[PDB]
Amino acid sequence: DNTSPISVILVSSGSRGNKLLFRYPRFSDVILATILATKSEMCGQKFELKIDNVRFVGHPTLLQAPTMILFNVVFALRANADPSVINCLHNLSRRIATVLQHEERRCQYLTREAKLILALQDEVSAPFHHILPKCKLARDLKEAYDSLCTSGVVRLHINSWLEVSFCLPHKIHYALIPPEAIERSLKAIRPYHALLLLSDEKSLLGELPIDCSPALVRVIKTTSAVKNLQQLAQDADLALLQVFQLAAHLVYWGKAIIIYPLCENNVYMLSPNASVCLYSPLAEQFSHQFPSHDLPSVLAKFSLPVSLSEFRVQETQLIQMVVWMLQRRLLIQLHTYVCLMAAQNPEDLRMFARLLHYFRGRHHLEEIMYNENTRRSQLLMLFDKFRSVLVVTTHEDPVIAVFQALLP
Amino acid sequence: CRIECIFFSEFHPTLGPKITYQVPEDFISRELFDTVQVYIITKPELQNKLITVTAMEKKLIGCPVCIEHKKYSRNALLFNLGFVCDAQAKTCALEPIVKKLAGYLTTLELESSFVSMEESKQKLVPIMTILLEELNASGRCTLPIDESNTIHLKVIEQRPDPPVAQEYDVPVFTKDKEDFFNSQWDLTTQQILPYIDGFRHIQKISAEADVELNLVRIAIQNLLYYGVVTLVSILQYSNVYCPTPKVQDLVDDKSLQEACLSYVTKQGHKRASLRDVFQLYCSLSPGTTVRDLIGRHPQQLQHVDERKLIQFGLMKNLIRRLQKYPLYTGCHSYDEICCKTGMSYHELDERLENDPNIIICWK
Amino acid sequence: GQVFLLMKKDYRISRNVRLAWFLSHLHQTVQATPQEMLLQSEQELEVLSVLPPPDEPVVPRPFLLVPSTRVTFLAWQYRFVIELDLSPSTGIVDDSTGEILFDEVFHALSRCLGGLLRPVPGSPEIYVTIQAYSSIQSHQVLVQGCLLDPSQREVFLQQIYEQLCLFEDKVATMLQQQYDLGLVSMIRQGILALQLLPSNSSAGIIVITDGVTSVPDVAVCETLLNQLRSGTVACSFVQVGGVYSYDCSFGHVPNVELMKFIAMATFGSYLSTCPEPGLTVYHRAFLLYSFL
Amino acid sequence: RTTKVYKLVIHKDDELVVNPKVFPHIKLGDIVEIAHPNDEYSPLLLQVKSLKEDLQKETISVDQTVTQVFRLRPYQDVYVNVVDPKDVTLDLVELTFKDQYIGRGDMWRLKKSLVSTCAYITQKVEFAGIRAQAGELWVKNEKVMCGYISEDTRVVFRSTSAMVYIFIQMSCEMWDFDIYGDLYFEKAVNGFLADLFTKWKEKNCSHEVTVVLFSRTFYDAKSVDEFPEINRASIRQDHKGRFYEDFYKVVVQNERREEWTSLLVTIKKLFIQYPVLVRLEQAEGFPQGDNSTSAQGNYLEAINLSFNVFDKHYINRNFDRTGQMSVVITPGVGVFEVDRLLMILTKQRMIDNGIGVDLVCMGEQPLHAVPLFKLHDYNIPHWINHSFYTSKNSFTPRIKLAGKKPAVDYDAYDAQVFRPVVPGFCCTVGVDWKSLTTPACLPLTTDYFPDRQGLQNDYTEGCYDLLPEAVQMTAQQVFEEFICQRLMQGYQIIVDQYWLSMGRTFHKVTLKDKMITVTRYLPKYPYESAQIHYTYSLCPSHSDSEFVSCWVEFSHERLEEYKWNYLDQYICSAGSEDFSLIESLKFWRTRFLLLPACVTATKRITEGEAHCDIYGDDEWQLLDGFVRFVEGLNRISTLTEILEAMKHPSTGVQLLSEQKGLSPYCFISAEVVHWLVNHVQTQAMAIDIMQKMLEEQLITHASGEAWRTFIYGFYFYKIVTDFASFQRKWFEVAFVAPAFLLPWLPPEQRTVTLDVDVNNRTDRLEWCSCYYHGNFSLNAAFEIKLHWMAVTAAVLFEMVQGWHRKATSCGFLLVPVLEGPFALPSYLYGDPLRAQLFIPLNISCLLKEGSEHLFDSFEPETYWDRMHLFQEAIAHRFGFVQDKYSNKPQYIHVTGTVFLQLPYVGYNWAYNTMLTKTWRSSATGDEKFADRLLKDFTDFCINRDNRLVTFWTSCLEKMH
């Protein structure tokens, strides 16, 4: 995995010489201490170094009887790592460094839990893979390294009371979706969209801190695949801007996915990047929750585009079969777009002229539905009357199709 | 890839490390050098290793060199000649140049003691004064120094690693060919080049040219690496395509319009309009094959080649592909199954249409 | 354009007095009164100055009042109560600022205090009671006095520094031994401390929150704002922290809308950033008061 | 499996001392393991050659060397386990040579002597002067530390002192950048060559190195004409209408060194000066020329040039090197467009000799078969040891990116869709460093054997008998010598009938009831091999930018034409006078010269003297030394009153006696003259009275042919008291006891058959032939030439070294000397990579106004035989003495380093490359003596500082 850092190093300088303080898991302990421990003039800014084919990212601090002047939390990476990973890891390093500096200023956390390991190194010299459980600090660093390798969400707790929440979008959105695409898609959301989560609501409220925003829990309680955000803002009694902010925050950490709600006539098909392996690891969970049905036998239904509710308590159970496999990215949603490229109807002409800034192929029919209230029959008849100016297209939505692993 | 300055420094026995020469002069200020001094003139363990350091919005590249022999002051000589660039320059192709330059300098010092005495030291300034312009403007420099050593430097850009070419892919030329010396090809590239047309899959090429399949795949991968050929899916009158959102960009980017109208245009016909092309790229359906469209848009297809139309749509991502998924492990396309089996898609049709044990899926 | 009206310390004009004199001298000429007689003005209020539509050079000439004229009201003596929230939702990093929003709140409070007493368009006594509340106890009284002579500020800030330093480690210990309401509750405590300061004149409550707090329900909010406007007290929100970007600590999203909607009521001000250092943002958010 | 633990005893003649009183069951010759019972170190196997009960109980004594090899501590515990000689038998053994010449017959004798023996690693195997060394022992494809050798073990010989030839193709690709940003030349020199030299230094090899740089250049010329007629002799026409010329530049020739890192700078300098040198720029009087591509280069002719120089291994044979190696380094990938018949010819020459060619390509490994030949069709060559040198991200490409040229039936199309060098096994990227550091000799045995009935359809059947039995060699060593003689010709045995195979020829040598039968089978239709006439331009090593046109014939020897029936007769006669050595056989030959030891002048020159003209231009003392040396070679008044006094045992003369085949009271016919002119009036009177004494018929010569007159010198004479045999058994040398300014004028070789088995060290007789100058003089060198077929080269070298020491004691020099130092590549003694140096002797400053050139006073008749004396007068000042070799005048330095020739204005100068470090001494100077002599001689010949006229004027006075 390119995104996975090779190792995590903690080094520090001062009026005792450079001293490597931790390394998890081809360089000497003196070489690294000499090169990675910079001077005060380079403090407070990004630190990037490259040697042969190994890269080092860090952020010194200047740390302001003390015997320590500065430290550095460096992460090692492959030479060909993506620069966004470098920036994310530098941000994580700065987040660690600032809280460590605050702990130093308050209770001298650093140069009290730094000489014990210093002396313990001599005791094990009669050192960084046999002193780990002797003092919590290296344990936190090892946990961060493991989370980066596997989880992608680092929830660290230093001094048992300072929380540090960080996310690595590269290893999270792997329906390997670039973080830039998600960020771009997340600034173009509309009130007629819906929020949906894979996990159960009860299992979603246990991750949050002991002082969340009440709007956070309020959104989770009254979120469903049928309602949209506007019908959620009123019920939770929140402003639409706050609803958008909360939805973006939840989507960013991979705990929420934005889809169009489940109307009866939503038209779907299989995602192009689907994986019907007939022995896939995900097919071992579809049967583990739904025994009587075989996944390659149900996914075959959505070959041609079919309506959401046309027989795709059997119906009341089939809806769950379209939520678990839509929180999974197996299918997509099609949509009808129009672009411009009868005269004896001034009433229709006035409405058509009013809704003329949408016919660029970038606005969907249901956007017109929501913005200018006009029944499906009226809009469809309006489009059908013209047969020489407007072009009808049937394709996916490039804003929400990002989530189902489909870049534009 | 511009080079802001080239600087030469060495371990001065009296004043310690300091800069000795810069081109242009005084580009690297002392209060900047005395910080990267640790990574510039390094401990012996770091010798013969490229060092790239970012500081003060500048990017310093170097390779410290230590030559150990008794004749020198401290039984060793330390020197480094390095480059300066901007903090955001993509200098991944400037490392081999620095390494080879350090090799040249150490060979010169070992042979003619070029760097030891002060007589040949002053010759450095014109050398860098030539190097800067010869590399910035051209990226190539041939500079003679003495009767036995001549510096030859050529910069090569590092293009990305290529994908893998499967047996069923169809290669299509993108550089139009007829622009290279056939005598300068690998003599197996010359074997297969007359067989790449945009309609032949790798197995068919290997069958026609009597070349090993593993070798043909490697050759096509190399052509991908250089960017001379691309890969598209097989073309057949029973394929199904679903339009892509990027189709809209066809109407909102003049260069793409011109390229599409030029390529799709039938040879020997008036250039096709855009009104008959944006309709073809939106009238395709997951229930209409390339055969129904022969009679569905008869007037529209009067200046375009259907094969070229579909191909161009594929390369520019204006069109997606729909296949059939049933040895029927599931992860095999219909075309791959047919190619391994050796029967037609229609032949495979009367082999799963009436034999219900495993069903057909479109993805 | 704009007419500035000064209070009297001895009495307290009611809410309708300002509207009454706005209506009475409607379409009537007014004048900027001399400097030396303003202290001898036996009238309830004082007409400091008036400007036709920056400081549009107003020569001592009469101007006719119009219904569209903006009237601003100042006062001679003011009181304020300063509340902080030190909830465990304010123990994260501020990536843009660089600090942690436990020192940055003190920085904002210090700057607001310093830039509120330095100094007269076309032409002074402040009381402060500070207490800090948390979600884990009720509140700690930090000032029951504080005349605030302007040339004493440094000693005052140094003194209130230790009262927060001792507070900080208590919360740290109480959460160390924990692993191995909200705004509606805070605002109540604002009113209670108000009836311990001398006599008349409008009061203010400045709360410095991170936006994590939120109102429980609508009926309780209505009950809170009814009592808030009952005493004619202006509440202000000094927001701490940076933008609400995606990459923030999980669980932390400010409630900008709630505090803006509360600030618009009770004639309060919402500040986005505490700016670095008459008629300034500091001197207009609190000391100024209008009705139209 | 006894476990009798012991206590070690160190010892310093079999290298193992044991007591049968302690091991009664162990007999002599049995294996004796010695290893610490609790040691993880590998065990040690040895032999109990001898028994001596005096050795201590519970103690076995072994030598220090084997103990240090097997890592056994003193006084430690050991085991005495004895295993049967059928379990530890090795699977493959390797021995290497060093600084020794060993023929294949000697290797065969050494191998068959080593059978059934216990051998460890780095043992010193010695046999009859051959000194090999084990270096890798294999059992079941696993390296072991010791083992046993049986009658089925594989033995391999390699060498660390071969003769190497290195060729670098300087085609256009030399100047192209590779995918890593480096030139191909930089890859070749700074890369491969430095690594090879470093490996040689690490492995302690002492090869002889020859380095050549070669290329090919085309021209833009219509029909010759344009070429200056002087270089037109080296222009060839391709069969496409193109004018091309081959070029060869020699960097170093026949050179031995202790380090080779100093040569890379020279090759770099040649790289810089190359394009002008090969006439690509500044082509004055020439058309415009272009370099060739590697596929269009002259690859297949450098190989044949090497095959030519290697086909003359028997001429000027020396005793220091063994093995041959030819290396071609190319910038291409291994594709060439070669002629169709030259490929067949070079393949035939490959299959004839045993010198395998090595190719080191340096381009990226291609996606097809390698190497490739594009005939003027493709052909894979399976007889070239090729390799690809990979220089010290990922995805290395494998295709050369070409440069930029500057400016209906809808159911059928669907249906018709699913309806050499191909095996390019890209794995040979390894570089066979082992084959480049210690070349392996041709295997002594082979497994192939044709059908028992297919010989009638391909070969005839010749047969001849021999009866060797009819001190004399037994009829069992003769058969072994028969087997050996085939071996040095390049034969291999197939695995007392003995089959032999070489190329298409087969031999069978058998012995039965004391009779040796030989049967030959030769192909019925041997493929013809038309000679290829080749022309090229050559720059000699000493030169700087001068090219010389040369021509050479590529030919394939007729193996069936070898006179195998006369050599057998020569062997069976034990050096009888009936059979001699004929030129058709490639009998080994060498030539030595005995020279006066001018030590003082040579030491002065070596000390730093500037001019070498100080050699100028005691007799009986040197005479005594010469007669003593010749003695060492052989291994030893009036009326009759003078004769009676001579017969006195203490007054007259010495008495050479006590020698087999020598009559008593014999005397040397030279020392008696010395005593006569002493005790008894002139040399002429001495010889006259000696002739009279012979006429008196009381003292004669030991030959018995008294008809011969009295010859003064080293001749044998007896007193008081058949011819060819004496002349074939003893030496006998006679004694033949300014010019360019004067009014007036202004046998020779004898044979002796020598027995080589002195200080007997072998069980068979060895003999050679010696041809020496018939008379001796103190102004001319003494020539001795050895011709030999059946001799152990080590024994001959030992005898020659004894001669060298004896001559050194006698104040002389005995140095090996080249045979044809002034021959052209076409002749027998020529060298395709050697050309003579020219020195111009300007007669212009000597000439005065008036008379045109010189010799005006002298008659014009004496002008073509008088200038020759003038030149020799200058030559004698530089230590050059006459060399009456067995035509044009030749002069050789007293140091034995440099030759000299008078062409018929100037001299021809050449080096003696057969003088190696071992032969060097005080008299012969250092290794940089000839080069410092060239400078002085050339500068004197151009009249630098008017040194030439200072000689003419100073010599003109003696005429007056």
Coordinates of C-alpha atoms in Angstrom, one line a residue, chain B residues 219-343:
Chain B
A219 CA 5.6 -5.0 -26.2
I220 CA 2.1 -3.4 -26.1
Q221 CA 2.7 -2.5 -22.4
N222 CA 5.9 -0.8 -23.5
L223 CA 4.1 1.1 -26.2
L224 CA 1.6 2.1 -23.6
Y225 CA 4.4 3.3 -21.4
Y226 CA 5.8 5.6 -24.1
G227 CA 2.3 6.7 -25.0
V228 CA 2.3 5.5 -28.6
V229 CA -0.8 3.2 -28.4
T230 CA -3.9 2.9 -26.3
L231 CA -6.3 0.1 -25.3
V232 CA -10.0 -0.2 -25.9
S233 CA -12.6 -2.9 -25.7
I234 CA -13.5 -5.2 -28.5
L235 CA -15.9 -3.8 -31.2
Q236 CA -18.9 -6.0 -32.3
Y237 CA -22.4 -5.3 -33.6
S238 CA -23.9 -6.7 -30.4
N239 CA -22.2 -4.4 -27.8
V240 CA -24.2 -2.3 -25.5
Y241 CA -23.1 1.2 -24.4
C242 CA -24.5 3.5 -21.7
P243 CA -23.8 7.2 -22.1
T244 CA -21.4 9.0 -19.6
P245 CA -22.0 12.4 -18.1
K246 CA -18.9 13.8 -19.8
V247 CA -20.9 13.7 -23.0
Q248 CA -22.2 17.2 -22.0
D249 CA -18.6 18.5 -22.1
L250 CA -18.6 17.7 -25.9
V251 CA -20.9 20.7 -26.4
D252 CA -19.0 23.0 -24.1
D253 CA -15.3 22.7 -25.1
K254 CA -14.4 24.0 -28.6
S255 CA -11.2 22.0 -28.9
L256 CA -12.9 18.8 -28.1
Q257 CA -15.6 19.7 -30.6
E258 CA -13.0 20.2 -33.3
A259 CA -11.1 17.0 -32.5
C260 CA -14.3 14.9 -32.4
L261 CA -15.7 16.3 -35.6
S262 CA -12.4 15.8 -37.4
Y263 CA -11.9 12.2 -36.2
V264 CA -15.5 10.9 -36.5
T265 CA -15.8 12.4 -40.0
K266 CA -16.0 9.7 -42.7
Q267 CA -13.1 9.8 -45.1
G268 CA -14.4 11.1 -48.4
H269 CA -17.4 13.0 -47.1
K270 CA -18.4 16.5 -45.9
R271 CA -17.5 17.1 -42.3
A272 CA -20.3 16.0 -40.0
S273 CA -22.1 18.6 -37.9
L274 CA -22.4 18.6 -34.1
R275 CA -26.2 18.3 -34.1
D276 CA -25.9 14.8 -35.6
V277 CA -23.2 13.7 -33.1
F278 CA -24.6 14.9 -29.7
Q279 CA -27.8 13.0 -30.6
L280 CA -25.9 9.8 -31.3
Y281 CA -24.1 10.0 -28.0
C282 CA -27.4 10.4 -26.1
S283 CA -29.7 8.1 -28.1
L284 CA -27.8 5.0 -27.0
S285 CA -29.6 2.9 -24.5
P286 CA -29.0 -0.2 -22.4
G287 CA -31.6 -1.9 -24.5
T288 CA -30.4 -0.9 -28.0
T289 CA -27.5 -2.6 -29.7
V290 CA -25.2 -1.3 -32.4
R291 CA -27.4 -2.7 -35.2
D292 CA -30.7 -1.2 -34.2
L293 CA -29.0 2.2 -34.5
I294 CA -28.3 1.3 -38.2
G295 CA -31.9 1.9 -38.9
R296 CA -32.7 4.1 -35.9
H297 CA -30.6 7.1 -37.0
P298 CA -30.2 6.6 -40.8
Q299 CA -30.1 10.2 -41.7
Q300 CA -27.6 11.0 -38.9
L301 CA -25.1 8.3 -40.0
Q302 CA -24.3 9.8 -43.4
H303 CA -21.0 11.4 -42.8
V304 CA -19.5 9.3 -39.9
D305 CA -18.0 5.9 -39.5
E306 CA -19.8 3.9 -36.9
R307 CA -16.7 1.9 -35.9
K308 CA -14.6 5.1 -35.6
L309 CA -17.5 6.8 -33.8
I310 CA -17.7 4.2 -31.1
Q311 CA -13.9 4.0 -30.9
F312 CA -13.5 7.7 -30.4
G313 CA -16.3 7.7 -27.9
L314 CA -14.5 5.0 -25.9
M315 CA -11.1 6.7 -25.9
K316 CA -12.5 10.1 -24.8
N317 CA -14.7 8.5 -22.2
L318 CA -18.0 9.7 -23.8
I319 CA -19.2 6.1 -23.8
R320 CA -19.2 3.1 -21.4
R321 CA -19.4 -0.6 -22.1
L322 CA -22.1 -3.1 -21.0
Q323 CA -21.1 -6.8 -21.1
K324 CA -22.7 -10.0 -19.9
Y325 CA -21.4 -11.9 -16.8
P326 CA -22.4 -15.6 -16.3
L327 CA -15.5 -21.8 -15.9
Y328 CA -18.4 -19.4 -15.1
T329 CA -16.7 -18.2 -11.9
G330 CA -18.4 -14.8 -12.3
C331 CA -15.5 -12.5 -12.8
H332 CA -15.2 -13.3 -16.6
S333 CA -16.7 -11.2 -19.4
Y334 CA -18.5 -12.8 -22.3
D335 CA -15.7 -11.8 -24.7
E336 CA -13.0 -13.3 -22.4
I337 CA -14.9 -16.5 -22.1
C338 CA -15.4 -16.7 -25.8
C339 CA -11.8 -16.0 -26.5
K340 CA -10.6 -18.7 -24.1
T341 CA -13.2 -21.1 -25.4
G342 CA -12.7 -20.1 -29.1
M343 CA -16.4 -19.8 -30.0

